[PDB]
Structures are given as C-alpha cells and as structure tokens.
Short mmCIF file of C-alpha atoms in Angstrom, two decimals:
data_model
loop_
_atom_site.label_atom_id
_atom_site.label_comp_id
_atom_site.label_asym_id
_atom_site.label_seq_id
_atom_site.Cartn_x
_atom_site.Cartn_y
_atom_site.Cartn_z
CA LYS A 1 -0.13 0.21 0.18
CA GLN A 2 2.70 2.51 0.42
CA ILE A 3 4.67 0.83 -3.10
CA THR A 4 2.19 -0.88 -5.60
CA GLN A 5 0.34 2.21 -4.90
CA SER A 6 3.88 3.92 -5.75
CA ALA A 7 4.30 2.10 -9.34
CA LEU A 8 1.12 4.53 -10.26
CA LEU A 9 2.69 7.96 -8.90
CA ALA A 10 5.89 6.84 -11.48
CA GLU A 11 8.22 9.39 -9.79
CA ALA A 12 11.85 7.60 -8.36
CA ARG A 13 12.97 9.89 -5.68
CA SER A 14 10.54 11.12 -3.44
CA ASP A 15 7.19 8.66 -2.91
CA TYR A 16 8.81 5.84 -3.74
CA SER A 17 11.85 6.58 -1.21
CA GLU A 18 9.91 7.82 1.03
CA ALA A 19 7.95 4.28 0.85
CA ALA A 20 11.12 2.69 1.61
CA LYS A 21 14.43 4.39 2.90
CA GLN A 22 12.15 4.93 6.93
CA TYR A 23 12.57 0.79 6.89
CA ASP A 24 16.14 0.53 7.55
CA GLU A 25 16.72 4.40 8.94
CA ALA A 26 14.40 3.63 12.04
CA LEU A 27 15.42 0.11 12.35
CA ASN A 28 12.07 -0.89 12.56
CA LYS A 29 12.53 -2.29 16.04
CA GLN A 30 8.65 -2.75 16.76
CA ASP A 31 7.30 -3.86 13.51
CA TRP A 32 10.44 -6.47 13.07
CA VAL A 33 8.57 -8.61 15.83
CA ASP A 34 5.77 -9.91 13.74
CA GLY A 35 7.81 -9.24 10.06
CA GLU A 36 10.39 -11.79 11.45
CA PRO A 37 9.54 -14.92 9.55
CA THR A 38 9.71 -12.58 6.30
CA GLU A 39 13.85 -12.14 6.36
CA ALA A 40 15.40 -11.52 3.09
CA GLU A 41 11.84 -11.94 1.32
CA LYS A 42 11.47 -8.39 3.25
CA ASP A 43 15.22 -7.34 2.84
CA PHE A 44 16.01 -8.11 -0.43
CA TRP A 45 12.54 -7.18 -2.33
CA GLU A 46 13.00 -3.48 0.13
CA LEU A 47 16.65 -3.71 -1.31
CA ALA A 48 15.37 -4.62 -4.86
CA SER A 49 12.81 -1.48 -4.38
CA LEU A 50 15.54 1.07 -3.64
CA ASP A 51 17.08 -0.04 -6.60
CA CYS A 52 14.56 -0.37 -9.50
CA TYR A 53 13.67 3.43 -8.94
CA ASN A 54 16.54 5.05 -9.06
CA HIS A 55 18.60 1.90 -11.22
CA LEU A 56 17.79 4.61 -14.45
CA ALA A 57 18.68 8.02 -12.64
CA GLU A 58 22.28 7.35 -10.70
CA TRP A 59 23.35 10.39 -9.41
CA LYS A 60 23.83 10.72 -5.28
CA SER A 61 21.03 8.44 -5.42
CA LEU A 62 22.52 6.14 -6.36
CA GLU A 63 25.75 6.60 -4.49
CA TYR A 64 23.62 6.20 -1.31
CA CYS A 65 21.44 3.75 -2.46
CA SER A 66 25.03 1.09 -3.04
CA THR A 67 25.93 2.62 0.43
CA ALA A 68 22.71 0.71 1.41
CA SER A 69 22.84 -2.17 -0.38
CA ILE A 70 26.16 -2.43 -1.03
CA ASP A 71 29.39 -3.86 1.65
CA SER A 72 30.53 -0.93 2.17
CA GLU A 73 31.26 -1.21 6.09
CA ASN A 74 33.04 -4.81 6.13
CA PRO A 75 33.35 -5.94 2.37
CA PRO A 76 35.11 -9.68 2.57
CA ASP A 77 31.89 -11.30 4.28
CA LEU A 78 28.98 -11.08 1.57
CA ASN A 79 32.06 -12.58 -0.88
CA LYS A 80 33.19 -14.85 1.60
CA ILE A 81 29.97 -16.21 2.07
CA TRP A 82 28.75 -16.46 -1.37
CA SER A 83 29.85 -16.38 -4.82
CA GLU A 84 27.10 -15.06 -6.52
CA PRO A 85 23.28 -15.32 -5.51
CA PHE A 86 21.02 -14.35 -8.26
CA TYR A 87 19.91 -11.40 -5.68
CA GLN A 88 23.52 -9.52 -4.50
CA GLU A 89 24.90 -10.18 -7.97
CA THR A 90 22.42 -7.55 -9.42
CA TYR A 91 23.79 -4.80 -7.55
CA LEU A 92 27.41 -4.93 -9.42
CA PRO A 93 25.64 -2.51 -12.02
CA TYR A 94 24.01 -0.01 -9.25
CA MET A 95 26.55 1.19 -8.02
CA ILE A 96 28.40 1.52 -10.66
CA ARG A 97 26.00 3.23 -12.76
CA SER A 98 26.89 6.10 -10.36
CA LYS A 99 30.48 6.14 -11.69
CA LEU A 100 28.59 7.62 -15.08
CA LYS A 101 27.42 10.75 -12.64
CA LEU A 102 30.84 10.80 -10.57
CA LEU A 103 33.04 9.68 -13.30
CA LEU A 104 31.55 12.82 -15.31
CA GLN A 105 32.76 14.68 -12.12
CA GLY A 106 36.34 13.62 -12.22
CA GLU A 107 38.50 11.81 -13.95
CA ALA A 108 39.57 9.60 -11.39
CA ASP A 109 37.05 9.22 -8.68
CA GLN A 110 36.53 6.80 -5.51
CA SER A 111 33.65 5.08 -6.84
CA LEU A 112 35.15 3.91 -10.22
CA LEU A 113 38.69 3.43 -9.28
CA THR A 114 37.60 1.31 -6.06
CA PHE A 115 35.42 -0.26 -7.97
CA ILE A 116 37.06 -1.27 -11.46
CA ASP A 117 39.74 -2.49 -9.47
CA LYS A 118 37.75 -4.79 -7.07
CA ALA A 119 36.09 -5.94 -10.33
CA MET A 120 39.97 -7.07 -11.30
CA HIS A 121 40.72 -8.51 -7.56
CA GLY A 122 37.53 -10.89 -8.42
CA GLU A 123 38.42 -10.90 -11.88
CA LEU A 124 41.55 -13.59 -11.08
CA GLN A 125 38.79 -16.15 -10.22
CA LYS A 126 35.50 -16.39 -12.37
CA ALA A 127 36.73 -13.28 -14.63
CA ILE A 128 34.99 -14.00 -17.90
CA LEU A 129 31.09 -15.04 -17.13
CA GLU A 130 30.74 -11.81 -15.01
CA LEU A 131 33.12 -9.47 -17.71
CA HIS A 132 30.85 -11.22 -20.34
CA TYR A 133 27.38 -10.47 -18.14
CA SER A 134 28.20 -6.99 -17.69
CA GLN A 135 28.22 -4.75 -20.29
CA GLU A 136 28.38 -1.72 -18.15
CA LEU A 137 31.80 -2.82 -17.41
CA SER A 138 32.71 -1.93 -20.95
CA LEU A 139 31.55 1.66 -21.38
CA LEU A 140 33.89 2.89 -18.09
CA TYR A 141 37.64 2.54 -19.80
CA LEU A 142 36.83 5.39 -22.58
CA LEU A 143 36.90 8.41 -19.79
CA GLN A 144 41.13 7.98 -19.68
CA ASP A 145 41.12 7.39 -23.56
CA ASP A 146 42.16 4.23 -23.61
CA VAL A 147 40.58 2.28 -26.61
CA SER B 1 10.57 14.72 -23.42
CA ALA B 2 10.78 13.63 -19.07
CA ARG B 3 7.55 15.59 -18.52
CA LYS B 4 5.28 14.29 -20.28
CA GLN B 5 6.14 10.74 -19.43
CA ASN B 6 5.68 11.51 -15.43
CA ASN B 7 8.24 10.72 -14.24
CA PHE B 8 8.52 13.55 -11.79
CA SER B 9 11.58 13.14 -9.69
CA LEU B 10 14.42 12.39 -11.90
CA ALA B 11 12.80 15.36 -13.59
CA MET B 12 13.05 17.40 -9.85
CA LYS B 13 16.21 16.92 -10.37
CA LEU B 14 16.74 17.86 -13.53
CA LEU B 15 14.40 20.92 -12.68
CA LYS B 16 16.47 21.97 -10.33
CA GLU B 17 19.62 22.07 -12.96
CA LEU B 18 17.59 23.57 -15.87
CA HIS B 19 16.23 25.89 -13.31
CA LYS B 20 20.03 26.50 -12.06
CA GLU B 21 21.60 26.33 -15.24
CA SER B 22 20.53 28.08 -18.45
CA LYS B 23 20.46 31.51 -17.23
CA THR B 24 18.80 33.87 -19.42
CA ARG B 25 15.36 35.77 -19.96
CA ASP B 26 13.96 32.87 -22.26
CA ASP B 27 15.55 30.07 -19.60
CA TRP B 28 13.33 31.14 -16.80
CA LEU B 29 10.25 30.58 -18.93
CA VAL B 30 11.38 27.61 -20.64
CA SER B 31 12.03 26.02 -17.16
CA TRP B 32 8.66 27.37 -15.74
CA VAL B 33 6.43 25.49 -18.77
CA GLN B 34 8.45 22.54 -17.29
CA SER B 35 7.27 23.35 -13.09
CA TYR B 36 3.44 24.27 -14.76
CA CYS B 37 3.47 20.88 -16.74
CA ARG B 38 4.49 18.69 -13.62
CA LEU B 39 1.93 21.07 -11.49
CA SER B 40 -0.45 19.40 -13.92
CA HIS B 41 0.83 15.98 -13.42
CA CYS B 42 0.49 15.97 -9.44
CA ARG B 43 -2.58 17.98 -9.48
CA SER B 44 -3.77 14.55 -11.07
CA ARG B 45 -2.66 13.68 -7.08
CA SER B 46 -5.01 15.46 -4.25
CA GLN B 47 -3.89 18.07 -1.96
CA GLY B 48 -1.51 19.63 -4.35
CA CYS B 49 -4.62 22.46 -5.64
CA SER B 50 -3.39 23.86 -2.39
CA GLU B 51 0.60 22.99 -2.32
CA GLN B 52 1.88 22.79 -6.22
CA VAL B 53 -0.26 24.64 -8.06
CA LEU B 54 0.67 27.30 -5.65
CA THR B 55 4.52 26.68 -6.09
CA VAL B 56 4.55 27.25 -9.13
CA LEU B 57 1.65 30.42 -9.92
CA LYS B 58 4.05 32.13 -7.60
CA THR B 59 6.46 33.71 -9.90
CA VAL B 60 4.03 32.83 -13.23
CA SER B 61 3.62 36.36 -13.22
CA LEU B 62 5.75 38.43 -11.29
CA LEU B 63 9.12 38.00 -13.33
CA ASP B 64 6.63 37.50 -16.17
CA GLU B 65 5.79 41.13 -16.23
CA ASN B 66 9.27 42.15 -17.23
CA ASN B 67 10.08 38.82 -19.18
CA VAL B 68 10.06 38.77 -22.96
CA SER B 69 8.65 42.02 -23.64
CA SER B 70 7.61 40.28 -26.88
CA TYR B 71 9.28 39.82 -29.49
CA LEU B 72 7.45 36.47 -30.23
CA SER B 73 6.53 32.91 -28.33
CA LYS B 74 4.28 33.64 -25.22
CA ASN B 75 1.11 31.68 -26.04
CA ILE B 76 3.07 28.57 -25.20
CA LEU B 77 4.53 30.22 -22.30
CA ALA B 78 1.22 32.03 -20.75
CA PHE B 79 -0.82 29.38 -21.61
CA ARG B 80 0.60 26.95 -18.41
CA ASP B 81 -0.02 30.38 -16.27
CA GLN B 82 -3.57 29.65 -17.92
CA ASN B 83 -3.37 25.75 -16.33
CA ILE B 84 -2.35 26.83 -12.80
CA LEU B 85 -5.62 29.41 -13.32
CA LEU B 86 -7.95 27.03 -14.11
CA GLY B 87 -6.41 24.07 -12.06
CA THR B 88 -7.61 26.47 -8.89
CA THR B 89 -10.47 28.56 -9.92
CA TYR B 90 -12.65 25.58 -10.88
CA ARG B 91 -10.84 23.36 -8.07
CA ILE B 92 -10.90 26.32 -5.00
CA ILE B 93 -14.81 26.98 -3.78
CA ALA B 94 -13.86 28.20 -0.61
CA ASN B 95 -12.72 27.06 2.63
CA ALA B 96 -10.04 24.29 3.63
CA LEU B 97 -7.49 25.63 0.91
CA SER B 98 -7.85 28.69 2.75
CA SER B 99 -6.23 26.93 5.70
CA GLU B 100 -3.23 28.88 6.27
CA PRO B 101 -3.16 32.17 5.76
CA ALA B 102 -0.39 35.07 6.43
CA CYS B 103 0.32 34.95 2.53
CA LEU B 104 -2.09 32.81 1.20
CA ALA B 105 -5.25 34.52 0.56
CA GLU B 106 -3.33 37.92 0.16
CA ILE B 107 -2.18 36.00 -3.02
CA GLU B 108 -5.87 35.53 -4.30
CA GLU B 109 -6.32 39.30 -3.57
CA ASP B 110 -3.27 40.28 -5.29
CA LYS B 111 -4.15 38.15 -8.82
CA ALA B 112 -7.70 39.35 -8.63
CA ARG B 113 -6.43 43.15 -8.19
CA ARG B 114 -4.19 43.80 -10.85
CA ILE B 115 -5.45 41.27 -13.64
CA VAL B 116 -9.66 40.77 4.14
CA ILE B 117 -11.76 37.64 3.69
CA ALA B 118 -14.52 39.29 2.41
CA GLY B 119 -13.31 40.80 -0.92
CA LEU B 120 -12.83 36.78 -1.37
CA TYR B 121 -15.51 34.91 0.51
CA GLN B 122 -18.28 36.97 -0.85
CA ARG B 123 -16.16 37.75 -4.26
CA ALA B 124 -13.68 35.56 -5.05
CA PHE B 125 -15.79 33.90 -7.57
CA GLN B 126 -15.87 37.24 -9.75
CA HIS B 127 -12.36 37.48 -9.43
CA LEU B 128 -10.74 34.01 -10.20
CA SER B 129 -12.35 32.86 -13.51
CA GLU B 130 -12.25 37.02 -14.52
CA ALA B 131 -7.59 36.67 -13.32
CA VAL B 132 -8.01 32.90 -15.28
CA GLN B 133 -9.83 34.60 -17.85
CA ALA B 134 -6.87 37.59 -18.89
#
C-alpha cells in the first residue's frame, strides 16, 4: 500500500524513496517482531525496490543506494559467504552506474577506481562470466582515452 | 521529453539543474513551462491544489511582466499560466484550501486585483474566473 501504490505515482526520488527509506533508517524495532519470518523476503525486496526506482537515475541517490545495498562496512563477509547470488549479483551495475555521474565529476574518482580495481581482484577467479555478463564494465574505460 | 512520460522526480533533479543552469531570459520561462506541466501532473494527485499549484503559480506573473517584452513566442508560455489558474478557480470553491493564511488568501486578493476575506469570500468567484480569463 506504500509501494504498489507507488508504481502508479511514476516518480523515483520522493514517493518510492519515502515509501522505502524509513524501513532501514528507523531500525523498525517494533514491526520486525511480527515481520521476523519474512527475513530476506522483506529485506532484499525493499533492497530491490530501492534499486529499480533509481537504477535509471543514478546520481547521489545511487551512491547512497549502493551505500544501502553495498558491503561498505566490512566488504569481505558477503563474498566470503556467497560467490554469486541471484540477487546481490544484481547490484554490481547499480553502484557502478553511479560511476557515470561521479566519473563525469572527476576523471579519476573514488567509486570508479575502487570498483574497477576490486572487480579486477575478483576477475582473477571467474572473470569472464561476469565480465561478459556486464556490458557496463565496457562503457567505463573510455574516460581515460584508452580504446 | 521527461515531462509527458510523468517520471517526476528524476525530472525534479533535472528541473533543479535547468532552473539553475540556463541563466537567460528565455531560460526562466522555459524551465517554468516544465514546472507548470509537472503541476498538472501532480494535480492529478490530491491536495496539490493547495500546494504545488501555489509553488508554481507564485512566479508565473511576477518576473513575467518583465520577461520577454514581446518579441515572439508567448502562447506556449502564457498558457501554462492559464493552467495554473483554471486548476484553482475550478477547484477552489472556498475554505479548507484557505487554511494557511498570512500570505495565502492575500495572493487571491492581489491576482484578482491587477488582472481581508470578504473581498474574496463574497467576491472571489467574480475574481478568479476573471484573472484566469485574462
């Protein structure tokens, strides 16, 4: 009733974002008792939603949305538990589409550099499947004039 | 292009960038057509008749008397003004929407004037449809 009634509103920075953000900001300590069985369902879905509204927009909304779904504080447990899930493996382009906006800002920037590097760290083991899966991985190089 | 599709909020950040960026006399009006369309788009939703129609009707004639001292091209820019006006004269019957005065009802007095409740409560229907009429 917050979000299926957002598909209508056809906006992707206010209505959906207010329908989504308070779920993680408030900690939902009293509504997590009844919604405790959902687990990943309530989670990843909200996770997923916070993507598919801004997945097109990128911009500060995106770096912050990664920040929500990324592995920023402690980035090795996620990869050390799963290699590729049919959910978190979907946020890889999300953060990096934000590259487009911050890579526009500066020629060598935190998001892009850290990313493409760690993407090469994970390239060493099962590169080609992921490098093939993502075309966006291509569109990024052209910045530093190296075709 | 973003306007008609009704994407809104991506178009919010865009309307901020264009409002900011283009910085000429035809700019201001160009951005305003966009905010006014967005006005119709959220008038589709409820209570914006009080809110957003005010947010965009505010400057639709302040900096407008001094803008493109014609010159050509005005129809496509003055009409959306007419939209922010019918979208109230036809919606605003009385009361409720006047809830937040100090500045609000004052606006109806002034707009009706060039184009403090009784000059509106007893008269604003011969005022609004005429301001929109011009």
